[PDB]
């Protein structure tokens, strides 16, 4: 039996910083002590479609009910509603008839998020895409878009701190898969847009001040990814191609069932993922870099931009959990156990005490939201750290 108690880890940290280069794990292990152990059910939620947090987690992005204006909130922290929950010892806050429970459900969202900006970017009858959101490496701005039929597409960059629209490009005849960042990729201030109808890939670098400058314009292309500023990875239909746009030379081709392609993916899934480009010290989790991740993959492209959160609780090096639901609605709550001892640590459940479900974790904080969506009805719940004192 090993000491799992947080006091042991705190004292150990005080007397020793470990070997050189290990001080990151000395604090990553703290997520096995502090976790979202409480759940408030059916929180009142403003008329907006929530999307995600910023890579640094300071901001939160929502799309207004008009589908033409962007709402930027500031995240107040996972302790933002601790005082509201005192005396409610337990693991969940059941949806009850008492006035305190409905009061908490009415105050929680405004406790956690504070509106900062409402920027009207869409025009000419265009609507913002719900799933299109990219963040710059400095996290100073966000990339959004607005619109098989063809329509005029528009791309915008918005400063998050100030809310001012910085730059915008337009495309009279464009067909980009703006949903889930499919037709868009960002890597180290290199932004690539993928025009499927025009069979085109367009490149820009973004300035720290937030402007677009043209770089270049280049079986059928289906999807895109950017391995680096020197190499694209294109799809055809399937066939995969790694190509160089500086030397205009095809580097490699692959068939979708090829085995050497599969082994190279197993070798460099981490490089294909680009989980946490926004900083120099990274902690990716993938089959290319973890024992358990490769174990699950072996027991069983291209990658979308920024599709993987860096949440430490989703890191397989720290927590054992069922892989089916979080990387329709889960028939069961997802349980998270510790890796070191296997003991149960915390449960997360999106359902009220088929429907589409979605789970959002803070990139580092012990905070999460869960959304259940139907044809016309939404329900959101808040999972957060809670103690009674």
């Amino acid at each position: 039996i090993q000491n799992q108690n947080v006091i042991h880890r705190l004292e150990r940290r005080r007397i020793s910083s470990g070997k050189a280069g290990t001080h990151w794990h000395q604090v990553r292990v703290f997520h096995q002590n502090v976790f979202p152990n409480f759940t408030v059910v059916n929180v009142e939620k403003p008329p907006c479609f929530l999307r995600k947090f910023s890579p640094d987690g300071r901001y939160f992005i929502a799309f207004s009910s008009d589908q033409t204006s962007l709402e930027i909130y500031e995240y107040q922290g996972c302790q933002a509603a601790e005082d509201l929950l005192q005396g409610y010892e337990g693991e969940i806050l059941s949806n009850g008839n008492d006035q305190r429970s409905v009061n908490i459900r009415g105050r929680l969202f405004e406790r956690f998020f504070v509106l900062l900006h409402i920027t009207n970017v869409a025009a000419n009858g265009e609507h913002l895409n719900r799933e299109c959101s990219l963040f710059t490496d400095d996290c100073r701005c966000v990339i959004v878009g607005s619109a098989s039929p063809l329509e005029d597409y528009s791309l915008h960059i918005i400063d998050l701190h100030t809310g001012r629209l910085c730059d915008t490009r337009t495309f009279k005849c464009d067909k980009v898969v703006l949903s889930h960042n499919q037709g868009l990729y960002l890597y180290k201030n290199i932004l690539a847009i993928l025009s499927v109808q025009q069979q085109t890939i367009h490149v820009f670098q973004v300035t720290p001040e937030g402007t677009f400058i043209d770089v270049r314009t280049i079986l059928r292309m289906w999807k895109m990814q950017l391995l680096d500023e020197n190499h694209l990875f294109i799809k055809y239909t399937s066939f995969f191609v790694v190509y160089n746009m500086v030397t205009t030379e095809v580097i490699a081709v692959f068939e979708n069932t090829s085995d050497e392609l599969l082994e190279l993916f197993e070798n460099f899934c981490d490089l294909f993922r680009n989980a946490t480009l926004h900083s120099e010290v990274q902690f990716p989790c993938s089959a290319s870099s973890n024992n358990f991740a490769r174990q699950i993959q072996r027991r069983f492209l291209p990658i979308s931009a920024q599709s993987y959160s860096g949440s430490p609780y989703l890191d397989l090096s720290l927590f054992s959990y069922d892989d089916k639901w979080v990387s329709t609605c889960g028939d069961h709550p997802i349980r998270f156990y510790a890796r070191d001892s296997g003991l149960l640590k915390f449960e997360i459940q999106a359902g009220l005490l088929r429907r589409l479900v979605a789970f959002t974790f803070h990139p580092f904080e012990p905070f999460a939201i869960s959304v259940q969506r139907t044809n016309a009805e939404y329900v959101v719940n808040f999972h957060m750290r809670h103690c009674c004192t």
């Binding site: 680096d228 790694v242 580097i251 490699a252 460099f268 490089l271």
Partner: protein, 53 residues
């Protein structure tokens, strides 16, 4: 203890007179002869180029 005889000796006089520092401040510009640069391109693309050969 038969395992402690014949301990290695460099100089027989070392520590034989034992009884129970200046900071170096470099000022002369001496140009380094070599520089340790890493492979600029990442391992995946380097492997792809190698396999292209």
């Amino acid at each position: 203890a038969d395992f402690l005889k014949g301990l290695p000796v460099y100089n027989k006089s070392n520590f034989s007179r034992f009884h129970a520092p200046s900071v170096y401040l470099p000022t002369r510009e001496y140009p380094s002869e070599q520089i340790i640069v890493t492979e600029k391109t990442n391992i995946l693309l380097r492997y792809l180029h190698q396999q292209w050969d």
